[PDB]
Amino acid sequence: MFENITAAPADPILGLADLFRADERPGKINLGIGFYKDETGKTPVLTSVKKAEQYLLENETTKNYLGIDGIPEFGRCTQELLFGKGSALINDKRARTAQTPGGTGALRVAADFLAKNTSVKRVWVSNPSWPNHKSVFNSAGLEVREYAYYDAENHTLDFDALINSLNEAQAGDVVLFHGCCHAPTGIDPTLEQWQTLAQLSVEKGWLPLFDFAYQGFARGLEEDAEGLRAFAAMHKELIVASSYSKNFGLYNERVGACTLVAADSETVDRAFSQMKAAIRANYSNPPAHGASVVATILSNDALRAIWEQELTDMRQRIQRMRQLFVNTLQEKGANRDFSFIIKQNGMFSFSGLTKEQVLRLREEFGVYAVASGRVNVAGMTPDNMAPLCEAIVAVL
Amino acid sequence: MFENITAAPADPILGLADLFRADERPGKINLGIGFYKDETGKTPVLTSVKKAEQYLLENETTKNYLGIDGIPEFGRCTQELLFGKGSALINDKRARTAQTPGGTGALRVAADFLAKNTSVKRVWVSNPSWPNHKSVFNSAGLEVREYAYYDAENHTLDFDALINSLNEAQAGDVVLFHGCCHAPTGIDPTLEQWQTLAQLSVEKGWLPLFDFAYQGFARGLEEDAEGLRAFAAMHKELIVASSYSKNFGLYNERVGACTLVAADSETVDRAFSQMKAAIRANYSNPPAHGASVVATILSNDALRAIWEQELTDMRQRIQRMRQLFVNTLQEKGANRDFSFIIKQNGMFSFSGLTKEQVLRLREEFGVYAVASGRVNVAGMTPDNMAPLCEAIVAVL
Ligand SMILES: *Cc1c(COP(=O)(O)O)cnc(C)c1O
Numbered sequence: 163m164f165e166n167i168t169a170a171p172a173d174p175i176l177g178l179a180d181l182f183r184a185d186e187r188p189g190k191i192n193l194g195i196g197f198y199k200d201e202t203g204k205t206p207v208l209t210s211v212k213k214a215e216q217y218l219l220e221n222e223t224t225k226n227y228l229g230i231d232g233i234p235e236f237g238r239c240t241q242e243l244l245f246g247k248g249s250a251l252i253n254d255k256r257a258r259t260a261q262t263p264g265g266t267g268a269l270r271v272a273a274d275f276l277a278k279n280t281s282v283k284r285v286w287v288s289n290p291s292w293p294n295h296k297s298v299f300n301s302a303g304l305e306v307r308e309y310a311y312y313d314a315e316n317h318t319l320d321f322d323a324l325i326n327s328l329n330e331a332q333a334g335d336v337v338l339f340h341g342c343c344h345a346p347t348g349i350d351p352t353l354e355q356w357q358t359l360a361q362l363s364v365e366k367g368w369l370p371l372f373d374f375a376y377q378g379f380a381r382g383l384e385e386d387a388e389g390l391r392a393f394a395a396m397h398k399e400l401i402v403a404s405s406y407s408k409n410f411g412l413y414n415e416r417v418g419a420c421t422l423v424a425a426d427s428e429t430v431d432r433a434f435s436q437m438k439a440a441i442r443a444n445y446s447n448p449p450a451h452g453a454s455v456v457a458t459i460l461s462n463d464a465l466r467a468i469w470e471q472e473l474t475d476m477r478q479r480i481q482r483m484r485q486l487f488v489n490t491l492q493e494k495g496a497n498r499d500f501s502f503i504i505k506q507n508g509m510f511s512f513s514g515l516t517k518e519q520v521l522r523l524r525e526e527f528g529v530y531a532v533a534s535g536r537v538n539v540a541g542m543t544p545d546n547m548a549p550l551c552e553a554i555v556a557v558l
Numbered sequence: 559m560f561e562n563i564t565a566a567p568a569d570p571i572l573g574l575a576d577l578f579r580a581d582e583r584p585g586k587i588n589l590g591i592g593f594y595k596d597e598t599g600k601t602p603v604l605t606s607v608k609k610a611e612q613y614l615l616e617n618e619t620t621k622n623y624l625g626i627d628g629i630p631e632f633g634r635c636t637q638e639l640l641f642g643k644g645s646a647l648i649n650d651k652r653a654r655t656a657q658t659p660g661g662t663g664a665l666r667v668a669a670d671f672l673a674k675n676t677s678v679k680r681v682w683v684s685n686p687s688w689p690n691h692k693s694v695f696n697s698a699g700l701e702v703r704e705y706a707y708y709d710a711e712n713h714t715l716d717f718d719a720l721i722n723s724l725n726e727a728q729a730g731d732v733v734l735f736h737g738c739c740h741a742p743t744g745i746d747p748t749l750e751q752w753q754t755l756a757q758l759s760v761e762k763g764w765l766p767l768f769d770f771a772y773q774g775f776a777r778g779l780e781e782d783a784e785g786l787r788a789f790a791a792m793h794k795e796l797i798v799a800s801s802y803s804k805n806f807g808l809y810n811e812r813v814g815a816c817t818l819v820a821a822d823s824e825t826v827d828r829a830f831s832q833m834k835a836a837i838r839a840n841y842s843n844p845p846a847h848g849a850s851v852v853a854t855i856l857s858n859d860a861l862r863a864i865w866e867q868e869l870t871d872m873r874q875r876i877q878r879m880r881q882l883f884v885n886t887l888q889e890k891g892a893n894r895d896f897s898f899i900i901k902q903n904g905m906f907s908f909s910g911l912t913k914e915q916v917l918r919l920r921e922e923f924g925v926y927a928v929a930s931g932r933v934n935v936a937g938m939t940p941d942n943m944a945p946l947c948e949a950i951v952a953v954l
């Protein structure tokens with residue numbers, strides 16, 4: 163039965179992880195990680211979550227199943243974070259939120275719901291984009307298409323190419339957008355661009371699907387939601403897959419949400435019932451722990467204040483490293499421009515290095531990066547900054 | 559887009575839950591729950607898990623992503639629980655285990671892996687069976703077929719009808735088996751029957767898929783694995799979806815495993831890589847909490863001893879209620895036989911009541927049961943036993 167099953171393709175980032183471990187060299191740096199690290203090169207569990215976990219340990223009386231859509235407070239809290247405390251979408255009750263196993267799980271339930279309950283056949287993804295996108299949509303039976311986004315030459319958002327390729331999308335096609343901190347470029351549309359993208363979206367009849375995994379990492383919680391809120395003000399329907407893996411440092415507890423927005427409550431309720439049928443046929447109901455921690459933090463003034471402070475700390479550290487990187491390279495004698503690094507958001511960016519450069523950088527200096535030249539800024543610390551930049555300068 | 563989406567069918571057990579809440583009557587009993595309850599009608603978090611959770615709270619240093627297959631110790635521990643501490647399957651390394659979001663999630667990843675990596679098209683399910691089975695398999699694109707199992711007249715396993723209908727299954731067809739405490743009948747094959755079922759299974763070329771959600775609820779941890787171990791000794795390949803929701807009282811933390819067994823390590827590794835690709839396209843990686851709690855209990859002699867004692871306590875309570883039920887009915891004057899209740903395992907059984915009987919039992923006595931006459935024995939307490947049986951006798 164399984165005797166002729168061909169092996170699945172080796173995951174390139176996992177392959178890197180191994181090579182890094184097996185590296186005897188002491189001064190090795192790893193910039194192809196995919197998560198946050200502080201100045202110590204550690205990914206601690208936030209103090210606000212430790213507090214919330216002590217609270218749960220002392221107050222939980224049962225581990226009985228949650229409803230299909232999860233914890234009610236968690237849903238309410240994510241909707242406000244997404245649309246604003248007094249949004250009409252919330253007052254008119256046009257949105258329903260289902261707690262899912264992480265942001266990836268939210269995308270998959272959207273995919274299954276979309277594929278079995280609507281007429282969608284294609285999903286438009288940016289080029290480049292977070293790698294796992296295709297497989298999620300493709301396993302649900304949807305076809306994936308790509309629209310232009312990155313300008314390799316000038317290192318920016320090729321708005322023209324974006325809009326041009328996106329016009330080949332037909333009405334009823336789903337268009338996926340990164341809410342903020344676009345992965346892997348760190349380049350986000352400006353507000354005016356989001357506004358024209360929403361208006362255009364309405365004319366052509368796209369079904370927007372927002373992947374929101376870094377709210378709080380670009381400018382702030384509310385600032386980062388601006389784009390989505392520009393779309394939500396104009397659209398009668400949309401879907402948003404959110405993740406709390408990075409902003410709450412809860413990676414392994416799988417906490418995210420899938421929010422559906424329809425023209426009215428009657429329609430959102432009917433559509434939501436099918437989204438619940440999709441969940442039931444998958445994992446039945448969601449993991450309480452991680453989501454329970456998020457709901458108690460967000461609903462407690464004291465705990466939320468601490469959390470918000472921890473998040474800005476992370477944001478600022480990343481903002482600090484991008485700046486340090488740029489001018490440390492500018493000190494070692496770069497005779498090349500890397501100033502674009504300061505204009506990008508989140509922990510990712512394309513360094514502009516070639517595969518051969520990243521390869522010798524690894525074998526000759528122990529600096530590990532992804533073949534595409536993608537580097538994670540959270541892998542840089544004010545201590546490894548000098549040896550890093552010297553290696554960069556040596557291969558330029 | 560969603561404007562013409564038809565609502566999903568109302569879940570009958572959820573509908574019951576509501577009617578029960580809205581019942582003004584004081585002496586109401588609920589036998590259509592689906593989970594365990596102690597003498598107080600409560601579903602507490604076990605003492606061993608509370609201890610393990612205190613341990614984690616004080617020892618966790620990061621919430622970073624687990625590997626696709628989850629915690630390594632958790633996998634090792636479930637394999638021993640399943641196949642025995644020194645099984646050849648473990649020594650020869652023919653099995654790989656992936657931690658999944660609950661037992662339902664294990665079935666879904668098996669479904670997706672099966673549908674996209676093999677030639678399976680049909681899955682044979684017992685009649686009756688746990689309701690959600692069909693949707694899991696059907697959403698993965700597999701067709702579901704049913705084999706006979708229950709003998710309504712004599713209230714037992716219709717082995718003849720079972721084997722007879724199962725011969726229409728072709729080679730390469732998956733046959734689903736409940737490891738123990740068959741839901742919803744509580745009727746399990748005897749060892750000799752499991753042995754003939756395994757031998758037969760080998761001749762016809764079925765791919766056995768075991769759904770193991772109640773290990774420890776029939777006779778004991780090892781006793782309950784006998785059937786699976788009879789099959790594993792003869793088969794070169796099989797799949798087992800396990801759940802820790804009921805035996806660890808961890809319902810909402812979604813903890814289960816999907817174990818793949820192949821002829822050798824080389825083949826199980828190659829097949830397992832595709833199972834991991836399937837997980838990646840779904841929820842990416844599993845929820846650490848619930849599974850972390852299970853792994854620390856199972857690997858600690860002290861904590862495991864307490865847990866094993868808590869599990870037998872649950873088993874015994876259920877065994878006590880079945881006995882009490884039978885002779886309390888036999889005291890109120892039943893002039894009918896319910897002795898079969900004592901011969902069934904787990905918390906479920908068909909009472910033998912008709913839909914009209916269960917209906918008037920509800921509206922006239924406040925005793926809520928499923929339309930099929932299925933009752934949950936854990937909903938009975940030595941305190942509600944008399945009023946329960948009086949209602950039963952009144953509608954007979
Ligand atoms: C992290 C991430 C996700 C999914 O994350 P989970 O870890 O599954 O919550 C989805 N999309 C993007 C762009 C991400 O960065």
Ligand SMILES: *Cc1c(COP(=O)(O)O)cnc(C)c1O
Nearest residue numbers: 660661662688741769771801803
């Ligand atoms: C409880 C159960 C499952 C799945 O349970 P989870 O709650 O998802 O772990 C699967 N099959 C049967 C027969 C069950 O009783």
